Design a protein around this ligand. Structure first.
Ligand SMILES: [Cl-]
Lengths: 948, 139
């Protein structure tokens, strides 16, 4: 079995050099791959394994020299597979790619930071290898900017970093498989301890193989397209994985860094430097599976998970808190609590003596935590309870008060060190996670609210709120919000949709405010949308109404946004309701779908500038909420510079960002990855408040305005004006298959009969990610740079000045370059040849030329000859993934030709050893061609991760 | 029970059916599920107080000061309207809270329990219409 000698060779040819001296990535991937291939052989035979390995080697040769002969060879092998073998090959390559991502996480997580590799400017902040840690950022603020430590500490206490978890656009991988990935990562890591004993190393190898096989032998389909509650349970995995333990660890490190510049205090235990919000179960925009009851369910589930974790943690806290000397106040509380009926620690003590007052108070808190979980579970499972609300924690102050009493008391007695142990970690967890871990945002289209108001105004014979001009809408909305009469009752003709909207508001009213974040209006355009939501909130008896957040998606919505926000602040009722705080949401991907990526990036910079102008004019604290697709939505290092790049004063101590589902594993799956994530968010926020990026030279603005015009013209002329483009998009791309299959819970279009305008941005991105073409990300850049270069020979120099000195531009280009690295036009060509009509082939050809031209231009702009010349670590990891992804592409393409064309008979090969073909019985397509397709989609999706 | 009675009569057991069974049916019919049906009774002035607190809370004037014809006209426009009248955001005296809460209790109990709402010191159609409106707007 000298088979290993082959994969090593291929791997080392894929990543030739070393990206450092602790570069063990090729080693890691070889080890994992060898163990996996042996498992494949032991379960499905020597022939199956030899086939799979020949496929991998061919793919690696392709990602090396990009000879199309290699694609012809891969295809030749893959078409001759009957559905059984096709499923096993696709599954095989999905799992192999997963293992590659695992070795990547280990390598990243243990790479030694090179203090000599820092250049000294902001470019260092674009990679984890040279970015500033917390303390380095403190020293940067103090030295270069001559800020006093007191100013840094004060800035930090009032800072909030709000991470919003959203559902994954495809396979939000099951919590079980995450657990397995963890065990594999740990086995890998421990195998490379430079001090390990032979028997230890043996048992670790056997454990690694054992877990690789375990993960391979779990189905990844069947059952249901998981219900929204299931998707939410899966999203909450990272709290148990890393985040719960990770928050107090990060905060304590902040304490140390503050000590290391002379600050004697710690960050206050109730200060919300970290917050977590969730859309899982709250975003109903174009997702009818998300019902009112779904929202009630995920709210209660969250309250359960939080109470559970607090329950388990408070027992170790009770064991720690064995002191006797205490404050007079706490002694009073102990004697008071000692007057009662001790069920949840009979294994520990028959009862708790008054000589352990801390243990008394804490034991009572433990009792209240148990009753909160039991009552939430009864509310979820029935609808009523019998657990009195007076015996649980209903708001966060009830919970914090006894703990703060213990802390104060301990400090009174000079036991501050004891107080700063498990107790401090507990207080910080209560403050960060509250009673729910996450706060659920609600999201709905503006049109649904307009429908509701129109049904009401029709029911009152006042006219159609829909037909009303925006000024008439505003005037009516204002008179009603200021009025004393309720608006509607049960006697109201409600369509199924209008009933959905109102019932959602009623659910919101019947749940604790600690559970909710923001109500977000998709497709916001005018103040009447926000006012409409505010009115529906009031007239549905939502006692503590949510903050309303407009999501300005389209380009015209962005230009009109600051006018709208000004008009909203200028209204007396709204101005007093917001209490000096406004949060606006921007969607990088939505605006991209509208008007191309370059024009949307620049328009979003300008729109944030104007919104901060309005917020200062009227004295409101503006908070920008960054939706998916952004520069700040990337994974790892790049996030640091992306945040630093935001226009001055757009953050101001409140960062709200979407943690994309395709990135959450790379950012929170591992202990170090999580810590460094929280760190770069906190450090980037803190620094940007005090050290904004340079303001752009006026010529830079004028240039970007012109480029945006040309770029929008090209993007729209292709996507929207070319009549046959929609024909091409349906052939060269599996967009239709994505809409039909059990990959995401959402419909891909808002109106089934519409063109690209009615297509949601996620299937738009996804469709072109699968073919490694990435049109939605780069289309429009080519003609823009081409235009400015021809318009004046010297504009190229200006662009290069921007990339080297203007952060926003550098990060935008950098993102484009990263996406091009995940691109391969040759594969897009394979899809054309197999799936697209002949008279449409030149169309694709022209598109690919644009692809190529743009790439060259981006390179010229970035001053690079190769893609990602400045980040060889990422270039390496990407190349390693690409070798697996390419096979999944070819398999996807031929599987598509096989599905769409039953008149494409192929010379099948004999089946390859023991089955997986009988796990999808009720399939209308072939015995396992639907499953093969789903596998390649989940796989390519996992390999390409994030683009735009 | 009517099924038992019908069935017995079908089999020529009408005499048996006209015994304890007939007595039972008659007791069900006479006493219903409650034995008695409770009438509610309240002064007209208490209803006038409630309406006046509402009209004051809507800045339309004092329902009390209104002539009987103006009272009637407003009551009519409201009873025929599609918009509810008041909410929790309403300054309720202890008495007005008593009246509204009584209507809420009536709404949350089976109709078999109630007879008639009786207005002591009735004088004009606006008293009856007032009670009808409070009944509707208290669901
Ligand atoms: Cl005992």
């Amino acid at each position: 079995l000298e088979k290993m000698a082959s994969i090593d060779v291929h791997l080392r040819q894929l990543v030739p050099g070393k990206v450092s001296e602790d570069d063990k990535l090729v080693e890691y991937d070889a080890l994992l791959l060898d163990r996996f291939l042996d498992i494949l052989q032991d379960l499905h035979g020597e022939d199956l394994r030899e086939t799979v390995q020949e496929l991998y080697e061919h793919s690696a040769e392709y990602e090396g020299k990009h000879e199309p002969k290699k694609l012809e060879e891969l295809g030749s092998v893959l078409t001759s597979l009957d559905p059984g073998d096709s499923i096993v090959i696709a599954k095989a390559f999905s799992h192999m790619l997963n293992l590659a991502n695992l070795a990547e996480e280990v390598q990243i997580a243990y790479r030694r930071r090179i203090k000599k590799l820092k250049k000294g400017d902001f470019v260092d902040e674009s990679s984890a290898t040279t970015e500033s840690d917390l303390e380095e950022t403190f020293k940067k603020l103090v030295g270069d900017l001559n800020k006093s430590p007191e100013e840094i500490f004060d800035a930090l206490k009032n800072q909030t970093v709000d991470l919003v978890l959203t559902a994954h656009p495809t396979q939000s991988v099951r919590r079980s498989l995450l657990q397995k990935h963890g065990r594999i990562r740990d086995c890998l890591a421990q195998l490379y301890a430079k001090d390990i004993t032979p028997d230890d190393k043996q048992e670790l190898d056997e454990a690694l193989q054992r877990e690789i096989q375990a993960a391979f032998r779990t189905d990844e389909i069947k059952r249901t397209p998981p219900t929204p509650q299931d998707e939410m349970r899966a999203g909450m995995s990272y709290f148990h994985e890393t985040i719960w333990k990770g928050v107090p660890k990060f905060l304590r490190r902040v304490d140390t860094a503050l000590k290391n510049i002379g600050i004697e205090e710690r960050v206050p235990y109730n200060a919300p430097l970290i917050q977590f919000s969730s859309w899982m179960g709250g975003d109903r925009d174009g997702n009818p599976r998300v019902t009112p009851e779904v929202t009630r369910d995920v709210c209660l589930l969250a309250r359960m998970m939080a109470a559970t974790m607090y329950f388990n943690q408070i027992e170790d806290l009770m064991f720690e808190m064995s002191m006797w000397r205490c404050n007079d106040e706490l002694r009073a509380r102990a004697d008071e609590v000692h007057a009662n009926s001790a069920k949840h620690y009979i294994e520990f003590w028959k009862s708790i003596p008054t000589t352990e007052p801390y243990r008394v108070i804490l034991g009572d808190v433990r009792d209240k935590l148990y009753h909160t979980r039991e009552r939430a579970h009864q509310l979820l499972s029935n609808g009523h309870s019998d657990v009195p609300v007076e015996a649980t924690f209903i708001n966060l102050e009830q919970f914090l008060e006894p703990l703060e009493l213990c802390y104060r008391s301990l400090c009174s007695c000079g036991d501050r060190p004891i107080a700063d142990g498990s107790l401090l970690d507990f207080l910080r967890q209560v403050s960060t996670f509250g009673l729910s871990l996450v706060r659920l945002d609600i999201r709905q289209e503006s049109d649904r609210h307009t429908d509701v108001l129109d049904a009401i105004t029709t029911h009152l014979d006042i006219g159609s709120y829909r037909e009303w001009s925006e000024e008439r809408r505003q005037e009516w909305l204002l008179s009603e919000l200021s009025g004393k009469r309720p608006l509607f009752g049960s006697d109201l003709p409600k369509t199924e949709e209008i009933a959905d909207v109102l019932d959602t508001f009623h659910v919101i009213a019947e749940l604790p405010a600690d559970s909710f974040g923001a109500y977000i209006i998709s497709m916001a355009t005018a103040p009447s949308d926000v006012l409409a939501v505010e009115l529906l909130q009031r007239e549905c008896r939502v006692k503590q109404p949510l903050r309303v957040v407009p999501l300005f998606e389209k380009l015209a919505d962005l230009e009109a946004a600051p006018a709208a926000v000004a008009r909203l602040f200028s209204v007396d009722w709204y101005k007093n309701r917001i209490n000096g705080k406004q949060e606006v949401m921007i969607g990088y991907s939505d605006s991209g779908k509208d008007a191309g990526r370059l024009s949307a990036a620049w328009q979003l910079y300008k729109a944030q500038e104007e919104l901060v102008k309005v917020a200062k004019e009227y004295g409101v604290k503006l908070t920008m909420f960054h939706g998916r697709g952004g520069t700040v939505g990337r994974g790892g290092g790049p996030t640091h510079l992306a945040i630093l790049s935001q226009p001055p004063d757009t953050i101001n101590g409140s960062l709200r960002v979407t943690v994309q589902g395709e990135v959450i594993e790379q950012s929170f799956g591992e202990e170090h990855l999580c810590f460094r994530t929280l760190q770069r968010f906190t450090a980037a926020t803190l620094e940007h408040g005090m050290r904004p990026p340079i303001s752009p030279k006026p010529e830079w603005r004028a240039l970007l305005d012109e480029m945006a015009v040309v770029a929008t013209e090209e993007y729209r002329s292709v996507v929207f004006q070319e009549p046959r483009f929609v024909e091409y998009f349906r052939l060269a791309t599996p967009e239709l298959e994505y809409g039909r299959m059990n990959i995401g819970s959402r419909p891909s279009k808002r109106k089934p009969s519409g063109g690209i305008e009615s297509l949601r941005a996620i299937p738009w991105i996804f469709a072109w990610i699968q073919t490694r073409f990435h049109l939605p990300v780069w289309l429009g850049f080519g003609s823009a740079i081409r235009h400015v270069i021809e318009k004046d020979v010297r504009n190229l120099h200006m662009l290069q000045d921007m990339y080297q000195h203007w952060p926003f531009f550098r990060v935008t280009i950098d993102l484009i370059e990263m996406v091009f690295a995940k691109g391969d036009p040759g594969i897009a060509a394979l899809y054309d040849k197999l799936l697209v009509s002949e008279e449409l082939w030149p169309f694709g050809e022209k598109l690919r030329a644009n692809f190529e031209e743009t790439k060259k231009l981006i390179l010229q702009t970035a001053g690079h000859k190769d893609l990602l010349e400045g980040d060889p670590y990422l270039k390496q990891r990407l190349r390693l993934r690409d070798s697996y992804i390419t096979t999944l592409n070819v398999c996807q393409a031929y599987t598509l030709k096989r599905i769409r064309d039953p008149s494409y008979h192929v010379t099948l090969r004999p089946h390859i050893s023991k089955e997986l073909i009988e796990l999808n019985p009720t399939s209308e397509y072939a015995p396992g061609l639907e499953d093969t397709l789903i596998l390649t989609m989940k796989g390519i999706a996992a390999g390409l991760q994030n683009t735009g």
